[PDB]
Structure 1
Amino acid sequence: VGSAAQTRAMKQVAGTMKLELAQYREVAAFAQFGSDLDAATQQLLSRGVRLTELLKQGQYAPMAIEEQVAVIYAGVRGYLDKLEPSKITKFENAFLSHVISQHQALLGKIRADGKISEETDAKLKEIVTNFLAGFEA
């Protein structure tokens, strides 16, 4: 059935996530000795290993759609490149709580319209940068 059963908002992020995770599979064998490689391959490895950690989840705790969109948006833009892989889950856990407590009217628009408009993209860009700067590991 494919993309005919997705909302407009999820489609935009999942389109890029699909290709970025498809490129990583054909070079995953090189991961053991990757030091003696060019920068292009190491960039694919770096982005793929970051994207893998986001898909892990707990048990008996389903999420909501706009929170999934908000989580994946930071991942696909490269805002998590400099972090070490050991700390991705803690960052996701803290970011969800921060966005839930204060920024509720923003999530209302994503839930209502089902698509990411221009101004909402502009707002999310500032939100993620502010939180990332303030995280302090």
Structure 2
Amino acid sequence: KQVAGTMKLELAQYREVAAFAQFGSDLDAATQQLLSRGVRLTELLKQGQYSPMAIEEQVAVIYAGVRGYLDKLEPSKITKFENAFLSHVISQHQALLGKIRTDGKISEESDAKLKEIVTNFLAGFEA
């Protein structure tokens, strides 16, 4: 619920911004972001054929985009990242995963745990 509410909403505009002031071609950054982000979110939900998953992970990765953290990157790398990020968290932030799963929720702390983690992961993705 924590990411999704917002996301749903965001996607709603995102999808929407395909229709008002677009049937297919135009520009402005504010909104471009929304698109970018959106595109990302698309990937982020884009879950190829064959994919059983656990929700916190899902949230985990989702969180990254929602909380705007990869917007930057191209879709192509998302997936890759996502994967990568996954073994990383899986391994490391297994702790964290433990928690999030536990809390049924992400605590603010766990969030923070994400924040650095993700940022860093991204960074690690480089850095």
Which TM-score band applies after superposition, normalised by the shorter structure? 0.7 to 0.9
Give the unaligned 5+ runs of structure 1.
Answer: 1-10
Cα displacement string for residues 58-83 of structure 1 (whole angstroms, at most 9, x for unaligned residues): 34430012111111110101101111
| d(CA) in 2 for partners of 1:115, 1:38 | 35
Higher relative contact order (CA 8 A, sep 6+): 1
CA RMSD of aligned residues (A): 2.4
Deviation per CA, 1:55-111: give whole Å up to 9, x if none: 122344300121111111101011011112221111111101111112212111111
Structure with greater Cα Rg: 1
List structure 1 runs of 4+ shifted beyond 3 angstroms: 29-36, 58-61
Identity, in percent, stands at 98
TM-score scaled to structure 1, two decimals?
A: 0.81
* Count of paired positions: 127
Give the 3 Å change call, closer, same or farther, for CA 133–34 of structure 1 in structure 2. Answer: farther
Q: 1:116 to 1:30 in 2, by over 3 A?
A: same
37, 58, 66: which one aligns with 1:47: 37
Q: TM-score, normalised by structure 2?
A: 0.86
Ranges in structure 2 where 5+ consecutive residues have no aligned partner: none
Deviations for 1:24-51, whole angstroms, at most 9, x for unmatched residues?
Answer: 1122158989875332232222111111
